[PDB]
Write a protein that binds this ligand. Structure first.
Ligand code: CL
Ligand code: CL
Lengths: 85, 174, 286
């Protein structure tokens, strides 16, 4: 059955779009953390959280690529059986 | 970070200045929505794979799940980490609020110094010398108290951050 | 038998031995217990103290550590602040002095005599160096002799030629403040004379207060359970053109004694400081 592979490819790309959209929606807040005070502890906390947000965005961009390569494989594998007639 | 080496004017002024924890609280609400959204992503992904396994249930698909497993477990691990971020940001905000509260107010420090100079300005006959030394001990007490408050603040913040483990790269599927 | 460390080194010994504060007059950095004292091993002063044997590995020489424990929790503290010139009571007047500076004025020498049980220890700070050692202290006279010896080591002076007198303290401070405000004008000594102070005493006093060559302030502190208290009276010695004068309150609103700094009256003044301590007999107390 090739039509199921096409359906999965469509849902994977939808899921990818959600991951990408939620990351982008909240990035202005997660990367805008400021130290609540001028001491070094407050700075170490805010700096950690900004970098932690930034590395999360990279991790998600990488996950978006894994999902798109998965949808592509699903579509390519579906066109291997729908024309194999 | 050995803040006990800095005088109370420094530690007290540093914690009282700044914009407060609002930007931290806004980020906790944001991280918390990511947790909600990515739990939905994880649930939809598992469901997508199970529907495909149901609509064909053959060797071709059973091998796609095997090549997908590493990503699926990665996605589970990501959900656990996401749920921790908001919790630890609020632990940090509380640490800051307790540091702010327990730190000696600058006014007390200024008043100590001001009272000391009034005794100096009237110590020609030396009969306030001992009370001057008492005021020096109180200032050292302020120094010690601020050092203790920053110690505990650093340790609470250090513990909260230690629980935010590094994001790992997602494995490939195809 | 004695040792000398800079202010940094004295603070490390406090850390190695978990001593929070010593006498404030030594003006050392307070030590605050944390999760680690290993960052102390990075200070250069640590290896310097390892060479003198003060610290063997990570353990402080036990004779020295015994002396630090007296300073750390004494039953009795006797303090003497000595100056060449006017005594500034710790004030270094440079507006580039950082907050909480541990410096002391270059003209100031600070002597703390601590007792625990019968163990008498000496802590003396000059510049940025502190010297710790045992000290033989028996009666008021031994303390008086130690102060005088420290004072003469700065500037020699003979007892001023004045007539001893007791004056009301609050009236005296008010009249002394006005006299200072007038510049110590020879015509403004009126209300000091009207208090019964001799024309000779007024002249020597004005010289000692106006342009001293050396001063000493001596006072004491006693400790019970966790409460503390200073001597109600302070002994001030001052060296003016007209000789060395001694000022102190007598056991008691209060009365200030104005005396020539005779070895006997300096002994009387030290005793009067110790007998105004709040918790009674100073030679024996815990
Ligand atoms: Cl909170
Ligand atoms: Cl991860």
């Amino acid at each position: 059955n090739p039509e199921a592979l096409t359906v999965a490819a469509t849902e994977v790309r939808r899921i990818r779009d959600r991951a990408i959209q939620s990351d982008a929606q909240v990035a202005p807040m997660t990367t805008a953390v400021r130290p609540p005070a001028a001491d070094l502890v407050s700075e170490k906390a805010a700096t950690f959280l900004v970098e932690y947000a930034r590395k999360y965005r990279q991790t998600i961009a990488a996950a978006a690529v894994v999902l798109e390569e998965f949808a592509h494989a699903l579509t390519t594998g579906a066109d291997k059986y729908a024309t194999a007639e | 970070m050995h803040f006990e080496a800095y005088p109370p004017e420094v530690n007290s002024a540093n914690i009282y200045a700044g914009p407060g924890p609002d930007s931290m609280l806004a980020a906790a609400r944001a991280w918390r929505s990511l947790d909600v959204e990515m739990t939905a992503v994880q649930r939809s992904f598992n469901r997508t794979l199970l529907s495909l396994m149901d609509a064909w249930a053959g060797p071709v698909v059973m091998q796609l799940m095997e090549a997908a497993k590493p990503f699926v477990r990665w996605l589970t691990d990501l959900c656990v980490q996401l749920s921790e971020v908001e919790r630890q940001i609020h632990e940090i905000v509380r640490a800051y609020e307790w540091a702010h509260h327990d730190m000696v107010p600058l006014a007390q420090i200024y008043n100590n110094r001001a009272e000391r100079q009034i005794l100096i300005d009237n110590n020609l006959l030396g009969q306030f010398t001992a009370q001057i030394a008492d005021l020096d001990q109180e200032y050292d007490d302020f120094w010690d108290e601020d050092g203790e408050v920053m110690r505990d603040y650093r340790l609470r913040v250090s513990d909260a951050l230690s629980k935010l483990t590094p994001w790992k790269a997602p494995p490939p599927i195809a | 038998t004695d040792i000398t460390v800079n202010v940094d080194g004295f603070w490390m010994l406090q850390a190695l031995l978990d001593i929070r504060h010593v006498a404030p007059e030594l003006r050392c950095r307070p030590y605050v217990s944390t999760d680690s004292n290993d960052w102390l091993n990075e200070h250069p002063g640590m290896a310097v103290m390892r060479e003198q044997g003060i610290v063997v590995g990570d353990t402080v020489n036990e004779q020295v550590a015994a002396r630090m424990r007296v300073l750390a929790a004494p039953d009795l503290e006797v303090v003497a602040l000595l100056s060449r010139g006017k005594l500034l009571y710790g004030v270094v007047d440079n507006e580039d002095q950082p907050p909480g500076s541990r410096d002391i004025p270059d003209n100031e020498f600070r002597v703390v005599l601590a007792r625990r049980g019968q163990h008498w220890v000496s802590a003396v700070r000059v510049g940025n160096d502190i010297t710790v050692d045992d000290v033989s202290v028996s009666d008021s006279a031994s303390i008086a002799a130690l102060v005088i010896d420290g004072l003469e080591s700065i500037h020699h002076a003979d007892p001023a030629a004045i007539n001893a007198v007791n004056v009301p303290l609050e009236e005296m401070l008010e009249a002394t403040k006005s006299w200072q405000e007038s510049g110590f004008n020879v015509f403004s000594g009126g209300d000091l004379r009207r208090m019964g102070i001799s024309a000779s005493t007024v002249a020597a006093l004005g010289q000692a207060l106006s342009d001293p060559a050396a001063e000493v302030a001596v006072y004491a502190r006693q400790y019970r359970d966790d409460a503390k208290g200073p001597s109600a009276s302070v002994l001030s010695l001052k060296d003016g053109s007209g000789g060395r004068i001694a000022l102190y309150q007598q056991a008691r609103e209060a009365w200030l004694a104005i005396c020539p700094a005779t070895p006997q009256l300096v002994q009387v003044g030290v005793k009067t400081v110790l007998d105004t301590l709040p918790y009674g007999e100073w030679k024996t107390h815990s």
